[PDB]
């Protein structure tokens with residue numbers, strides 16, 4: 001929806017269909033890991049919190065940007081960690 | 095900045111393939127690894143944004159949040175994983191809101207459909223944030239698991255929702271930093287109000303829902319500011335998340351409307 005309007009709009013919808021399409025046919029046993037890893041993926045928020053923190057002037061901007069980035073990074077770090085732990089339930093003990 | 099662009103495009107591919115692989119028995123384990131790099135690349139590459147500063151505050155913030163979360167994730171019992179996924183998804187919502195909120199304080203857009211988008215993101219994300227924390231609270235028995243009911247709440251929630259949206263819109267014409275805070279508080283409040291009625295045992299579905307929520311929230315935040323990394327990934331997950339929510343509901347032999355209340 002920007003850079004520029006039409007192009008971006010295709011990008012929204014193309015991704016919406018694709019997001020959807022990849023997930024159809026997931027077995028039930030894979031629900032929650034999928035859930036965990038997609039949770040991880042949206043962790044990219046940091047990158048936008050980053051840019052916000054790194055362009056902040058007034059200082060109320062500092063704090064909330066700082067939060068943003070802490071929140072962001074938890075999302076990623078945690079997500080990754082959790083998904084890995086979930087995935088190990090599938091492995092035999094050697 | 096075709097370089098940052100190159101990196102974000104590869105990041106996009108890494109996420110897609112990664113999400114694709116998380117979805118199949120034989121590829122699942124490697125999926126998260128692929129998505130892994132996507133993030134590395136994304137984070138690295140974003141240091142190179144033009145006009146970037148406050149690095150120390152950035153590192154400090156990256157280190158704190160990544161370390162405390164990883165530490166927690168690695169120590170909890172397996173049977174407490176649903177709530178963990180919840181808290182980490184909360185914080186994403188928050189993230190999307192923090193983005194939204196700072197660009198607003200900077201009245202950084204003369205394009206108003208973009209302002210719109212940021213705001214929409216800020217609402218959804220704030221909601222996914224507090225809604226995920228309440229979910230957490232219930233699974234942890236910090237809060238009553240059962241649906242928490244009160245005399246005429248269905249209306250209060252609608253009413254709080256509508257007020258929020260309205261003051262949300264209000265920012266387009268007028269955005270006294272006063273009204274900004276009000277908007278988030280209402281958004282946040284509504285997250286809380288929303289999840290009170292959700293039974294403990296319904297929670298994995300609501301968690302998926304909020305996952306979809308934050309996904310969408312970041313995608314929106316992504317378009318509004320010009321960030322492709324976010325644009326693609328947010329919606330990807332927003333999309334896949336909403337479908338996932340539907341199949342989870344179905345697996346529980348339950349409807350998502352059913353979950354979203356179970357008593358008003």
Ligand SMILES: [Hg+2]
Nearest residue numbers: 016017020333
């Ligand atoms: Hg779609």
